Design a protein around this ligand. Structure first.
Ligand code: GTX
Ligand code: GTX
Lengths: 216, 218
């Protein structure tokens, strides 16, 4: 299973943690976006959206969007351990719906607002000071997550980390290395430190996040 | 099942089409965002993220994010018709993964880039011209969609529309009412007209998108 990735990339790290969780060994194919590797035909042919992470399975099926890959890894490759699949991706429609909402929250709100605030400062033009409005918006997302975590060990509830935790862990590790004071959000910090301690492959998460940290 | 919504809202319309597809009646509850109705304490208690659509089921279970609601509607309320659920949301992990990718594409790329380009023009400050970079990015998303649809009837493949078609249909109807010329993207236009002519709730989608046009009278 080929895995087109960068360690700094949060969505890549989310897949790496999920692959570790289900015992899938990824064949790592470092894909240098700064060089322009993702715009080479061999990547474009596989993925016309030219984005990482991209997974290519045993049969040549190509998949992207980290959170879609996460689900695929559990459904297909995690299936063999039924209690494991149920922990990572509970099948009850209500429980699963919360997992889904947290995944969409991560892509569309939590990580999105992180990117809109920080990317202008660290990429492209590299603006000295972040936008006050984009900052308030990002803080609102952290406040949402803090609220989700009130009286809850994990982001989507349950007694074990789900793929939503793994996704949001990749995101929040990126906040940390960006130098955002996560201790302002008590539930987020508590969840972050505890889940990082227990989730397999969280090492790669912190290590890769440190790579992203080099932009700051 | 209570449905906190506005007809103009694309994600609300995606839920409307999905509920129609699975034969679920929504108790419609207009929620005026400009009026701060989503910020009332009782609403925040149901949904601290204060966003629409919000669905409250028969047991008081509260759910938001339209695409999570779409999946929930199929699994809990559509699945009694096994064939119908399989069409809307195929269970084979490979086939389902493409459906999931398209749903995530819709929220994070297609609709997101629509919002980033048009919202500054229609909300708050109301800038007389859209940002060129944001326009290029939005066109790129339409280009991606057009490519997905090359030689295919539906967004995630298959012989029938899925929940991904319904979600992206709500988004593209919003492109249309914004005045974007979709004939620039032949596969998108072809798919849009065809799917609008066949799916349940397409009436709600077009009527609601027309309402969103209230922001684009200039
Ligand atoms: C090492 C730090 C560099 C910044 C890392 C950002 S992640 C790279 C980016 N990937 C994505 O935005 C994928 C997002 C998608 N929502 C997912 O979760 O997979 C990309 O391939 N962008 C290129 C493109 O889309 O063309
Ligand atoms: C402000 C209106 C913009 C025009 C209509 C956009 S849809 C309304 C908007 N809805 C959402 O943020 C939900 C998006 C979510 N991704 C989904 O698909 O459900 C909202 O409730 N926004 C208010 C909020 O989140 O506080």
């Amino acid at each position: 299973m080929d895995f087109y990735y960068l360690p700094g990339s949060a969505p890549c790290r989310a897949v790496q943690m999920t692959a570790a969780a289900v015992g899938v060994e990824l064949n790592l194919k470092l894909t240098n976006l700064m060089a322009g590797e993702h715009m080479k035909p061999e990547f474009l042919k596989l993925n016309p959206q030219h984005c990482i992470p991209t997974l290519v399975d045993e049969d040549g099926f190509v998949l992207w969007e980290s959170r879609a890959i996460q689900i695929y890894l559990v459904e297909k490759y995690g299936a063999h351990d039924a209690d494991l699949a149920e922990r990572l991706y509970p099948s009850d429609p209500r429980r699963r719906a919360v997992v889904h909402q947290r995944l969409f929250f991560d892509v569309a709100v939590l990580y999105q607002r992180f990117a809109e605030y920080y990317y202008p400062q660290i990429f492209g033009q590299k603006v000295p000071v972040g936008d006050p409005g984009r900052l308030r918006s990002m803080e609102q997302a952290l406040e949402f997550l803090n609220t989700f975590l009130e009286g809850e060990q994990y982001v989507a509830g349950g007694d074990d980390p789900t793929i939503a935790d793994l996704s949001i862990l990749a995101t929040i590790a990126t906040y940390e290395v960006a130098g955002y004071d996560l201790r302002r959000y008590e539930n987020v910090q508590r969840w972050y430190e505890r889940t990082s301690a227990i989730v397999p492959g969280a090492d790669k998460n912190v290590e890769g996040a440190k790579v992203f940290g080099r932009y700051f």
